[model samples]
Target: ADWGPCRTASGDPFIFVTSFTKNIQNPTDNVTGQTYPDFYQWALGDKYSGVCECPSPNPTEARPTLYKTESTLAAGHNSTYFKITNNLEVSTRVYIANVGNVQVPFINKSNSQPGRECDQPTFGWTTGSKGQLSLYIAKPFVGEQNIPQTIIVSVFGTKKENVYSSVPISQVLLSGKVTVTQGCELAAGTSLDIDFGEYQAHDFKGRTGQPPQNVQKIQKELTFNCTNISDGVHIYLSLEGTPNAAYPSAISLGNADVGAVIEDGKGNILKPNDSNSLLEMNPGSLYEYVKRKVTTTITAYPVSTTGKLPAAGDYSGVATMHVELDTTDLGAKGTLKFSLKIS
Candidate 1:
């Protein structure tokens, strides 16, 4: 519909349209004019001389008065303009609750209504529009989006006026895509060298009550900073290492008889090879990490199988912890090393 703003004259509502006519002026010179048959000529209402028909139902009595329903309005978005965040999912359409035009306060649309420039329900009141408005953009923008991008915004008729149709009656052209990024930069922790110290071979008697193997408590607190990360979006840490054959949950070491067992803060056993099982650093959410540093604590220790110590030599190994956001693998890492000595 090429309908612009409607106007009233003599209590009658009508629209203006252009009328064309055949070229009458003889082409003085061929170079000046190709002599197109149709030419821009008369401009008038519905026809060259007649006034355009008014909106439906009251063809001559009324113009389409603006009407909006409560359901069409946006929730908690009555401001002049709202901010939109970018979603990493490209297929998912990211949306802003509702944006308003302070200048166009009364955006009148067709529906059942009283005649002549009457007031009705509108959103974004102060320097705003009375009708419902929504804006959206396609995503997968990973970084900060300072340079605005083009997105589609549209307005629709009220439910009663158009049976709540999915199609919008008119559209808005705007380059208003502001991509606030959501991510975290994980900083690696200092090389953690854990030593079980020295232990006597007799200390490794596996029989009940013979001798309890020395258990060293290992605690590595890994800290990192995040920007623009929102709540409900989770952050996790995973320790990836070769698993000991005797103890699948422990990190493999040079000594086959011994392995280092790790546990997250939640006391859940961690396996170096299994990335699927991760420790949720910020339980419930990463909301607390917004503009702040977050810490992930993992504990580990060494144990020997078969009640026998490894060849009375040195035992050592390393494990790597990786940070993840939901399904995204953030390439942040921390190295943890373990060592044990026996004579």
Candidate 2:
């Protein structure tokens, strides 16, 4: 009897034996009917099969586009790490978003191996794959302080399938500060009290003394005590107050005829609300924190703006001495009190 059709592509016959016992022919046989113990008969034929081939060249992966000017990172960094150091505070929270727009974020959108689907990776932020940063400035002092942050980014690759796989994409940094009512303090002995003792109105003639106050000059030493602070903070001492109606360059003493002119003993007039050319308190590097005591000698003089002496019994005037260090104006101030007597 003939066997059934075979399933091989080459049309070779295939026979399968079952429970029906049958003694197969042995390849090793002798004419004396000797048993070929280890030899068994089997059918051999040629068959066809399919093969799988991989692509020769692979595709390249790319990062997100970054702006040219603001960013400091160079190209060709396909690794999972990056760093950015750049240029604050309040109740004080400052939120910085879309940093990747500069030295930006990176992700794998296209599969490195073609014809395969890969998960879309992301940075600290949402679908846009951007980074979100924040800062908390509480009870902070005035000066440029460092604000550093370490952000993580989620990654999905051929070997990584879990969502927990991530890396530190970059650590963004900035130089910032906060503004509060807390700042440098002025130590004691920072007061200025001048007294041009009694003088006759007739004795004031030809006494148009400028800053030297030749008529009745009074010189006193003033000092300041500033504590520790951040670098880049400058120290400045300024005198500002209401000006005399007759003499705008002098301080007001409620008298339109006479006014007092102040100076730093170096011939530069110290006008009310003027620049800091005469009273700069910085001794060394202007960028360093101020911790030393600043000492200066101020001179005052009485001048008649209209060439006539005052017929006053007692005169008094005031000016404010401001200890300006950077921008914070805590309680760094003093009063320049004056009293004069002219008959």
Top TM-score model: 1
Full-model lDDT for every candidate = 0.45, 0.42
TM-score of each: 0.46, 0.45
Backbone clashes in candidate 2 total 3
Q: Tens digit of lDDT per residue, candidate 1, span 1-343?
A: 2222322222221222221112222211111112222112221122111111224422334444332222222222333223333321111111112422212222333434334322222222111112223332223222334323323233333322333324333322223222344445555445567766666655665622121255557677667666545556688877778887766666877766667777774658777778677788863333322354566777776766445645787778988777777767765466677877777
Off by over 4 Å in 2: 1-142, 150-182, 209-214, 228-234, 275-278, 282-290, 325-332
Backbone clash count, each prediction separately: 6, 3
lDDT of 2 by residue, 255-310 (tens): 76667777877766678766643465543331222244556677787777655666
Top-lDDT candidate index: 1
Task: Give per-residue lDDT, candidate 1, residue 100.
Answer: 26
Scored against the true structure, residue 9 in model 1 reaches a CA lDDT of 27
